[PDB]
RNA sequence: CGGCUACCCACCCGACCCGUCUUGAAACACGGACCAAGGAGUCUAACACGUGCGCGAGUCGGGGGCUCGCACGAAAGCCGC
RNA sequence: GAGGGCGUGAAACCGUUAAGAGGUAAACGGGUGGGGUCCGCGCAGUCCGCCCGGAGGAUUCAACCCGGCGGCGGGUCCGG
């Protein structure tokens, strides 16, 4: 023996993305070669989330997009987001800015040609700027998932917060023993 | 679309011969067997390959035209060449060479046509 | 009964071509053009085997 | 992503005048993974059930 | 697909995967709920809080039927007429408003939210809400009760 | 004296036993290949001294001399004169092999043109006349 | 009699599919790697006339 | 290609009508085809055998030249047997030899007012 | 001449007969005379999580309808007031 | 070597032949040794592919250009 440490051999990590896309594995061919090619944490950090699932890359949203780049700062920069941008009902107003994301749906491509910017892909941004100069890399809302929900220490027990499963939220469904004083405890 | 051509035909195609070895390609217009990127007749833009003649006698060589994509009738320009190896040897080192067209795979053209001609001298 | 990617399809009521991923995706051509090859940093290619 | 000519062929073999535009179907992007998975599904459809 | 099941791989393995000692039979612990109150009541409680007793009154003969009231919110305003109609309309041309009708579209109650632009409109609908009340008085908009 | 194939060092196998089942030699219903024992009292198991070795990763041949024929050639198993010309490129490294199935008459035009494109074939000899 | 025979696909990932395949169908190197025999044939998708 | 749904594709419901055939079907069946000089001469393809029709084999172990007149027709068996063909037993009989009506070339026709009707009805229906 | 090898034999050393219930099996614990074939975590519904795909504040035709009568067509294509 | 439950014909079991062995019941793992079947090879003679200096024969390019087709490459984006 040489170890008394415990055996850990694999860290956490995913080296190779699990999905068969091909664009996506030409996408990942071509960041794995800048993020080793040209000292660029930028490429390095899009490289990881190009190696990162379907469902951690969370789809970013229009205002959202609108409103990071309304910050000082952002005028003459580039929205780059590995990751969709879709649609908003919300906001009536577009700016004239840039956008590089994968998968754009396509009333937000729509309104961005009608407000007058451009968007791009991966490619066209690698041949823009190998570095990553003039980009600002953006992520969507990954806690706001109804999955992320159920996730706690407990549904009541410090009452917890942590939303049970049942099927109809509504009376008659877990809404007796443990939740009101009345009848039984209360949380 | 070399790269995507690429991407779906290494695998799911009518060749990649994987029995009990390595992976062999058979391609009817190549140089080296294994199916790789840098040696490959039907996907690039600019190929590369020699075959024996039908008559017997001496080497033809097909070169990919490039003045006309999606047109197998003329995509592929033959010659057919009879010499004493040596001139021939020359020939392709001279077309390869004092060409753009093709570089790479310059001893990949030269090692097959010397292996058949000394397969085909007997 | 597709269409091209300006208009749409006037057969089929709700249907768009796909978004194209990569739109000029020849890699060979992107990895040696002069934007990418201003911005490399060394050619490397020793080896540093293992020194008895 | 631009749109060749391509001759239309006559029953003798000769190219004919008649020239049209290459639809923007045959420059949509390839995916033989989801061409695998869809066909996979339709195969599966494509059976009677078997011996109970 | 049992090639990709984990049996298949699991082929060799003298108790497959459910251990010697622990012999899991048929029903160790009893069928589906059982035991809610005796013996598995840190499972129903600390896990399903509320499951047990009654809660409140008994409407008997109840519809999801006559309570219909589909909410659409202030964001959701705007967009069930087009965008080229309230440019159009709202054009600098004069103090005319167009008419969001939330009954074609099939939702009945207002309810307010935040992003109401300065150029008024004329909201019809069955209810409303005071605080989109409040939001349609403050950007100068009109609101017209229907049934 | 046949070919004679590139620099190829001497192989080592660091056992060369093809390893025996347990109880193989007391049952005749048990075939030899190896099948690993999962009991909780057999000595196979526990690697007690003066019994069998169970098959691991330390008896992995080198990957120089893997897949080694004693000739110094590595085979591949052919059928046919498409499948025999594939190996033009790599004859000075790789055999051929003619499979089974192959009758005489097909068998003599394989090992001809084995003969022209000088690769080496594993049974030139059998399933003559 | 009542397993799950038949599975059902979304019509936007079936005309996906369509796509995808009418485009693959015009490279020539995927039709040879196929197995078709291409080497007399002339140009890729070939259009005939409408007295076929 | 099969269109009329029918009729069998079925190799088992196929071989069960055939080898349990009533004999008007086997007659069908057993049907031979014609010399070159006479279907030049009566336009007709084929026609089934009879029991005074004249044989040419022309596959089998006996092959060409051989124009007999056949003498019994086994519908059980799906065997007519030639006067022609003959094989000696071990004790010096002779006996027929199995010969499928398939593999017949009808030389000559006997000569019938049925079989005027049967010509008449195969030169309309080819036509 | 050379040859590892499912061939046979001898010699030195180690070596109790496998599977399980068990803290403990070679056990004076149980099953096993031998051999060939069959033989044990499947399927449906529901839920949860992870992953991949398409669309994405929308999504889904599984319910029907439309095409000419087609082996594969009990498939597939389309509906959109 | 298909002779009437007759295609193919394994294992358990038995007979015979050939070889080997036999006091610690038989059987096994590691290490060798002996014998036998079989395989590949020629056994004091088997290695090849290239260049050059030497000895004979037989041919015609290549070195340079005229004749000719097909492609590679950029410029006037000339002619459309
Ligand atoms: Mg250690
Ligand atoms: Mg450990
Ligand atoms: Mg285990
Ligand atoms: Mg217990
Ligand atoms: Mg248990
Ligand atoms: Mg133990
Ligand atoms: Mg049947
Ligand atoms: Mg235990
Ligand atoms: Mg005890
Ligand atoms: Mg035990
Ligand atoms: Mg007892
Ligand atoms: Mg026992
Ligand atoms: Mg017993
Ligand atoms: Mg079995
Ligand atoms: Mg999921
Ligand atoms: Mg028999
Ligand atoms: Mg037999
Ligand atoms: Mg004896």
New interface residues.
Partial sequence: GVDIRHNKDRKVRRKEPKSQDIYLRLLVKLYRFLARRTNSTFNQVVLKRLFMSRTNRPPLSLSRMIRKMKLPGRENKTAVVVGTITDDVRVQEVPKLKVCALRVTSRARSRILRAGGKILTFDQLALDSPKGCGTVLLSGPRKGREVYRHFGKAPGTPHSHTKPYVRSKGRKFERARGRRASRGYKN | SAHLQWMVVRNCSSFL?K???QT???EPNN????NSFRYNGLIHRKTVGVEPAADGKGVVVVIKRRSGQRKPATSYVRTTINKNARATLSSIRHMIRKNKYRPDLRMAAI??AS??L??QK? | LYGTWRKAASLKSNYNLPMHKMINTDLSRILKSPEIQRALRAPRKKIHRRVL | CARPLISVYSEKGESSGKNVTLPAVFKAPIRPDIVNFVHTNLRKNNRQPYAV | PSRLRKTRKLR???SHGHG?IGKHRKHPGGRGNAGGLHHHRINFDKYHPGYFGKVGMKHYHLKRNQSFCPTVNLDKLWTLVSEQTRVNAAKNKTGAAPIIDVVRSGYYKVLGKGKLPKQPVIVKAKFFSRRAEEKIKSVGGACVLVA | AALRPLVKPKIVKKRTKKFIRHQSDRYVKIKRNW??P???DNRVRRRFKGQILMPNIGYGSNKKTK?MLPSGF????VHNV??LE??????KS?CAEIAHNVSSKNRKAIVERAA???IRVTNPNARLR | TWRRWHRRVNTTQKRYAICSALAASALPALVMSKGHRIEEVPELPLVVEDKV | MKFNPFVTSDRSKNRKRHFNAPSHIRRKIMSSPLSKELRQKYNVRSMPIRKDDEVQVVRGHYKGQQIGKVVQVYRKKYVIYIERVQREKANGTTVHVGIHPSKVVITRLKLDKDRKKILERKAKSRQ
């Fill in positions: 011969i029995r009990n070895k062999y390609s058979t140089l080296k067997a294994r090692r097959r292996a058949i000394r397969s007997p | 060799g393995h003298v010697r | 099948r690993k999962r009991g909780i897949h590595r085979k591949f198993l498409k499948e594939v190996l033009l490129m790599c004859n790789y022209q494109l000088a």
